[PDB]
Enzyme design. Structure first.
Site, PDB file in Angstrom:
ATOM      1  N   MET A 103       0.827  -3.449   3.149  1.00 43.51           N
ATOM      2  CA  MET A 103       0.927  -4.338   4.289  1.00 43.51           C
ATOM      3  C   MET A 103       0.144  -5.651   4.067  1.00 43.51           C
ATOM      4  O   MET A 103      -0.303  -6.302   5.036  1.00 43.51           O
ATOM      5  CB  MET A 103       0.526  -3.651   5.589  1.00 43.51           C
ATOM      6  N   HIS A 158      -7.190  -5.715  -0.809  1.00 47.42           N
ATOM      7  CA  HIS A 158      -8.581  -5.577  -1.147  1.00 47.42           C
ATOM      8  C   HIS A 158      -8.645  -4.725  -2.422  1.00 47.42           C
ATOM      9  O   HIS A 158      -7.626  -4.442  -3.089  1.00 47.42           O
ATOM     10  CB  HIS A 158      -9.294  -4.889   0.008  1.00 47.42           C
ATOM     11  N   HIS A 213      -6.339  -1.586  -2.836  1.00 46.21           N
ATOM     12  CA  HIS A 213      -5.011  -1.906  -3.283  1.00 46.21           C
ATOM     13  C   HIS A 213      -5.043  -2.190  -4.767  1.00 46.21           C
ATOM     14  O   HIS A 213      -4.079  -1.903  -5.433  1.00 46.21           O
ATOM     15  CB  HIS A 213      -4.425  -3.166  -2.616  1.00 46.21           C
ATOM     16  N   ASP A 215      -3.367 -12.801  -1.305  1.00 43.95           N
ATOM     17  CA  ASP A 215      -2.677 -11.604  -1.778  1.00 43.95           C
ATOM     18  C   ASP A 215      -1.991 -11.870  -3.099  1.00 43.95           C
ATOM     19  O   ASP A 215      -2.224 -11.133  -4.061  1.00 43.95           O
ATOM     20  CB  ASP A 215      -1.664 -11.090  -0.777  1.00 43.95           C
ATOM     21  N   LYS A 218      -7.203   7.201   1.370  1.00 46.99           N
ATOM     22  CA  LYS A 218      -7.891   6.816   2.573  1.00 46.99           C
ATOM     23  C   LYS A 218      -7.061   7.217   3.827  1.00 46.99           C
ATOM     24  O   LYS A 218      -7.599   7.796   4.769  1.00 46.99           O
ATOM     25  CB  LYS A 218      -8.257   5.310   2.580  1.00 46.99           C
ATOM     26  N   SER A 254     -10.895  -0.909   3.549  1.00 48.80           N
ATOM     27  CA  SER A 254      -9.821  -0.992   4.497  1.00 48.80           C
ATOM     28  C   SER A 254      -9.670  -2.474   4.856  1.00 48.80           C
ATOM     29  O   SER A 254     -10.658  -3.202   4.915  1.00 48.80           O
ATOM     30  CB  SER A 254     -10.185  -0.118   5.736  1.00 48.80           C
ATOM     31  N   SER A 255      -8.424  -2.874   5.074  1.00 43.89           N
ATOM     32  CA  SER A 255      -8.097  -4.209   5.509  1.00 43.89           C
ATOM     33  C   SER A 255      -8.863  -4.455   6.774  1.00 43.89           C
ATOM     34  O   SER A 255      -9.200  -5.596   7.069  1.00 43.89           O
ATOM     35  CB  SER A 255      -6.610  -4.302   5.833  1.00 43.89           C
ATOM     36  N   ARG A 256      -9.184  -3.388   7.514  1.00 48.68           N
ATOM     37  CA  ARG A 256      -9.744  -3.590   8.826  1.00 48.68           C
ATOM     38  C   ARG A 256     -11.286  -3.577   8.880  1.00 48.68           C
ATOM     39  O   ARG A 256     -11.894  -3.832   9.975  1.00 48.68           O
ATOM     40  CB  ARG A 256      -9.097  -2.630   9.845  1.00 48.68           C
TER      41      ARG A 256
HETATM   42  C1  LIG Z   1      -7.632   3.276  -3.030  1.00 44.70           C
HETATM   43  O1  LIG Z   1      -8.419   2.952  -1.851  1.00 44.70           O
HETATM   44  C2  LIG Z   1      -7.685   2.452  -0.813  1.00 44.70           C
HETATM   45  C3  LIG Z   1      -8.298   2.330   0.431  1.00 44.70           C
HETATM   46  C4  LIG Z   1      -7.551   1.840   1.508  1.00 44.70           C
HETATM   47  C5  LIG Z   1      -6.253   1.484   1.357  1.00 44.70           C
HETATM   48  C6  LIG Z   1      -5.316   0.975   2.212  1.00 44.70           C
HETATM   49  C7  LIG Z   1      -5.379   0.755   3.763  1.00 44.70           C
HETATM   50  C8  LIG Z   1      -6.354  -0.162   4.346  1.00 44.70           C
HETATM   51  O2  LIG Z   1      -6.533  -1.287   3.803  1.00 44.70           O
HETATM   52  O3  LIG Z   1      -6.843   0.256   5.415  1.00 44.70           O
HETATM   53  C9  LIG Z   1      -4.159   0.784   1.577  1.00 44.70           C
HETATM   54  O4  LIG Z   1      -4.355   1.120   0.308  1.00 44.70           O
HETATM   55  C10 LIG Z   1      -5.669   1.595   0.140  1.00 44.70           C
HETATM   56  C11 LIG Z   1      -6.334   2.047  -0.962  1.00 44.70           C
END
Ligand SMILES: COc1ccc2c(CC(=O)O)coc2c1
Ligand SMILES: COc1ccc2c(CC(=O)O)coc2c1
Lengths: 279, 289
Positions: free
Chosen positions: B38, B42, B45, B87, B158, B194-196
């Protein structure tokens, strides 16, 4: 190590991983895979789905036979001899447990068209059909999938599945095969006693009357059909409906489909026909 | 096929375009890796992307699409972080050859019509008060899998409940794809990426290490059994500033209609002011620990 495939004869597979491997492996040799999904108990309607699939140059034909408990006759040797006789190379005959090893869990939810028409009496019928068809599509990975026009609402819903899920198959609709008097071929026709088989003619009579009355407009097409149905005894009409080609509301002029369904005793029959308004 | 330039970032916004390029690539021998996201990319991803790259002869497709279907109405959707500039810069810097960035119109030309209905796991945990959430997820993942047709698709642990449901999707519809879960990347103090995370102020950020702390504590306490794991986690969460717990649950690894044996997953969800945070961890009940 790919399961054995014997070209030019009838290769039967029950294991979904088996037919999947034969299919993948045949695709790579240059054959185009064609899927004919059935519930078995095969009649001439089914042989016409098969025939249209055989004429694709380079085709290999896969007929699935599977009674899907999710949406709802069992002639197993007969069915195979009938496919052997058509020159069909693959029959896929999975069990219920093999199709549903984790039971009922993730399923397809149809859009709003599935609550209409056949969806009146059987509000979950189409979720079961889409679920099973999507599964066969993913198992077999056909280039083309073949369905009768007899089950028109079902064909439209399939095209909606394919569109909505970005599926990479071509959906071919094959015109209804009919008995000499016009009755649309159906597994159910065998239940009709003679009086019923007699009155049953009215459905196809009414539709074709409509298709021809339709140079005089939509209302004349519907009135013609209704009159012919009104001339039949013991024919309890559940609906008679002119729709657009996709089954949305019928436009003012242009192409349409007229559908009907009716009960004759305990037997439910369907038929449908192409209609062009003022043409 | 449209232009494909190897060794560079190729951006496609049409489904037909990425589908055409996907298939041409696969036909030439390369294996197709899908990383569905989405955006707001970070380090977690990037672990996905890296795991995809280490699969040999692969080409990596990263999708970026804020799926409006998995969002409960009012404001969550509009509030979602969007940074396609960063991104795309990260993807280049990772050597990703294909980004697929569809429009809503291209993904939902007919609005919601045919959809995926998840099994009963989708009404539990996150799906409890968000009953359409996972239907939204499964529907876009299926569509992405059908557009891209990759050999493998990559998700983080996650969002553990999501990954399990996706494995369910894949088995139940007989999809020709391997699903790879990737372990959660954490900040130096244990905070799950987390993005959040960006929505946490300094005080909330500091309190937030409570989630991963409760969990790694439970994971160690677990030789003393399940009540001990669970009470260790609870005690840590209880002593943290402004951490309101929505659930703390010990389950089988499949989350589903099995009791826990000696291998489980402990899942927590908590609110820090208005930000909702998830984390979870592998748990072995003692003897297995
Ligand atoms: C591999 O560690 C992660 C941790 C979180 C995430 C997320 C979701 C988010 O950003 O909340 C997507 O891919 C991830 C991969
Ligand atoms: C091609 O004509 C037909 C007529 C009927 C069918 C059927 C099902 C049925 O028996 O109702 C499947 O394919 C058909 C094809």
């Amino acid at each position: 190590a790919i399961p054995a495939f014997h070209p030019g004869e009838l290769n039967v597979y029950s294991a979904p991983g088996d037919v999947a491997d034969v299919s993948r492996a045949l695709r790579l040799t240059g054959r185009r895979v064609m899927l004919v999904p059935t519930m078995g108990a095969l009649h001439e309607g089914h042989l016409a789905l098969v025939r249209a699939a055989k004429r694709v140059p380079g085709s290999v034909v896969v007929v699935s036979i599977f009674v899907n408990p999710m949406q709802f006759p069992r002639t197993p040797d007969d069915d195979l001899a009938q496919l052997r006789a058509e020159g069909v190379e693959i029959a896929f005959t999975p069990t219920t447990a093999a199709m549903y090893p984790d039971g009922l869990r993730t399923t397809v939810q149809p859009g709003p068209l599935a609550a209409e028409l056949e969806g009146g009496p059987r509000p979950t019928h189409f979720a079961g059909v889409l679920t099973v068809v999507l599964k066969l599509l993913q198992i077999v990975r056909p280039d083309r999938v073949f369905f009768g026009e007899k089950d028109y609402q079902q064909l439209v819903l399939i095209r909606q599945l394919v569109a909505d899920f970005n599926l990479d198959v071509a959906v071919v609709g094959v015109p209804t095969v009919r008995e000499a008097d016009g009755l649309a071929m159906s597994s159910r026709n065998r239940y009709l006693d003679p009086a019923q088989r007699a009155a049953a003619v009215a459905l196809s009579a009414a539709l074709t009357a409509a298709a021809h009355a339709a140079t005089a407009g939509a209302q004349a097409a519907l009135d013609a059909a209704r009159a012919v149905l009104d001339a039949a005894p013991g024919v309890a009409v559940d609906y008679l409906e002119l729709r657009d080609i996709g089954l949305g509301p019928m436009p003012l002029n242009g192409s349409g489909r007229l559908l009907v369904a009716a009960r004759l005793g305990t037997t439910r029959l369907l038929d449908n026909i192409a209609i062009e308004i003022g043409t």
